[PDB]
Design a protein around this nucleic acid. Structure first.
Lengths: 229, 229, 229, 229
RNA sequence: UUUUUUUUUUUUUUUUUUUUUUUUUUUUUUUUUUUUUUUUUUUU
């Protein structure tokens, strides 16, 4: 027979605005609102199909649009460094959410209606929140939005906080959010410096009214009459 | 080595009475009460064996009777469109429950006794409910019955509501029921229009007395004397 | 390609004392207390190793002793009829527990000490119960003992009842016990006829003092001083 | 076909200080603080990678350092005797924790700073405890430390007790600790003989302040203001 | 009357967790989308 020897060795950065800058410059040239809605709608499937394949670098063909992404989803590929100028599924989702929010402020009133028609946010909709509830809010439901707490005016965090305190999400999912800048301010500084910003941001989200299930309006009420969620 | 590219593209109906009509016309010619009892009794196994095979279209041989069914049970086959004139295991179960309830009203008093002897409803029996408790009630325990809330006089819904409020079933399983017609009325209209119908329907089901376990009568009581379910 | 057809068909007894009789006659000729202690001690492993193999009929070689058992443990083999004169791992365990209890009453006082030294009951010991606590009690911890509630004077049931009411076991595991005879009496008759028998039987078991963990005597107490089980 | 026979047979020690002695003599010749930090940091991965391979005896190459370990982690390999002079992952972790604590008492004040810089204890750090909180405490977080309750002055036990009573760990994980010596004293003797030692040991650990999550200081407080852990 | 739970011993055997503005992963993903997901009778 035989005897294996397995080896190990010692060990011992990234900001979003520059990674976003670079992305916008290179990639968003040949890109359209149809290409984006594809990405967000099929986000569910794209995550799984990537988690199956073992190939470290994979390309997505979203309609016409095509991007190369580091497949950090596959179990084996996790926890191996990703370049500061690299794209993961997560970062991509965040960038695109920024990209849209920018358009949604600098573009034509009829053009805005093309966005609100085409682009659907699975996670916001499931929880009974639509474009109508606020363009900055709706888009901050997209994962990756927390990279830009500045741009999204603390809603990524507010949405999280509202979910943990109503038992929906676990405390550990707010970890990444808390290691993030606000405008320029670092974690501890803004934690109280801008506490009242977050206070109001939560106030906004708390009014919106989540959706436990994907049901009717009358259903919500009707079922509740016998003791329901 | 290699590097995969995987692609995606955009996206963007069915009523039971017509699907049932068509089914009854074509399929229930060479069919018998023995063929049905087979389907419902071995329903457990039929679901699993279908969930194993990957073949999108499969045929069932229930004694003499033979049907072709779209195998929507297999994990890979889920969420790919099923024709409005197509059969799934679920729809089949519902149709057959309608079919029986129709017979049970338009047939001979000795013929009814052939039904009550032969046809067994696993789910109703497990929960300590028998034919004696009402032919419309017993049959509405079969999955698919919710497609015809009219035909079954709101019992499919009542049974569900009684189960969630006593913690047995999860809230999300009443979703499909709530997207369904009643006679002609749509969800929101009947939700209150026919609220008192459902009120009484629940009253009926609540009297019947479920069975936590598959035990004796004396057992129920005896065990309870030491602090039991 | 292809298209599968899978088929199904209709469907539509055992007493322990005769199955035990037959077993004792044929099998317990070339058998010893060493052979038994093997069976009970390695019961853990014997269950698993049988659950791996797919062979419907398997033989056990317990030291010298050798028996043929229907491998009803393997997932695929479950729920296919077992002859009334057949042996399963469960039945075997029950029979051997009867067999011992019989010896333990009809044999020499020094011979009894050979039993109490050699034969160990994993499940009774884990729960801090030994031979000292009663030969009829200790042996009724062996699975299969419930087949002979008569022989074991309601302890199989008492032990169960004591476990569910202290949250250790789930209610459904008392199902099999309740479909069993007592002397000659059937379920409902003895349920109250002999209620006071069971009352006292529980009284006995409740005094014995279970063991949450496999720890010391001082440990029990010591750890408890900081708020412990 | 075929028909299997599977066989079984009857059945019917170790002190740490001698196993440690032997280890220190033979193995810690060509060994360095860099080699150790590797072992503890990658402990997570080393456990899994060993649990995959089925080879009963495996060697670790921790930087330069190389050891042979009995792979008792692999499911199949569990519960087959390990020599009293043998190494398991667990024992190794304990020995190395002793080894360090010894150095940390008998070495130069600048040399101590090399240790505190290089060697990281994943489990202590996760729970917000650092070298600063006490060299004997920090090191007793390493698994295996309970073999030497003497050397570590009851902290291995105190840490456990503090965790079960605050619901973090399950009661059964204190089993191994309780079957262990203290100086020379056996379980029951020291359980009260040295009760006040453990009392103070717990007092120490209870002051240290655990960390539910891996978050900031301001985060701890900030999140708590909306009802948080 | 088949299975599922739990299977002794200062047996020292496994099972729980495993750091670092680690920016990696883990949670959950739109439409009266009618698609799956839940349970499945009897001295079984």
């Amino acid at each position: 027979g035989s005897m294996i020897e397995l080896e190990f060795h010692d060990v011992a950065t990234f900001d979003p605005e520059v990674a976003y800058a670079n992305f916008k410059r290179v990639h968003t040239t040949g890109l359209s609102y149809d290409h984006i809605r594809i990405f967000y709608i099929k986000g569910r499937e794209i995550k799984t199909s990537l988690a199956k394949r073992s190939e470290w670098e994979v390309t997505l063909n979203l309609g016409g649009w095509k991007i190369t992404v580091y497949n950090t989803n596959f179990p084996g590929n996790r926890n191996n460094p990703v370049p500061d100028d690299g794209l993961t599924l997560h970062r991509l989702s965040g960038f695109l959410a920024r990209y849209l929010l920018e358009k949604m402020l600098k573009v034509s009133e009829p053009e805005k209606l093309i966005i609100k028609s085409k682009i659907i946010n699975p996670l916001a909709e499931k929880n009974g929140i639509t474009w109508n509830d606020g363009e900055e809010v709706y888009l901050s439901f997209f994962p990756g939005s927390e990279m830009f707490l500045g741009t999204f005016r603390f809603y990524p965090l507010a949405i999280g906080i509202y979910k943990v305190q109503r038992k929906e999400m676990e405390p550990k999912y707010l970890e990444k959010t808390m290691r993030q800048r606000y405008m320029g301010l670092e974690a501890a500084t803004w934690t109280v410096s801008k506490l009242t910003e977050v206070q109001s941001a939560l106030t906004v989200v708390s009014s919106l009214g989540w959706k436990k299930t994907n049901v009717s309006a009358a259903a919500r009420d009707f079922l509740a009459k016998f003791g329901i969620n």
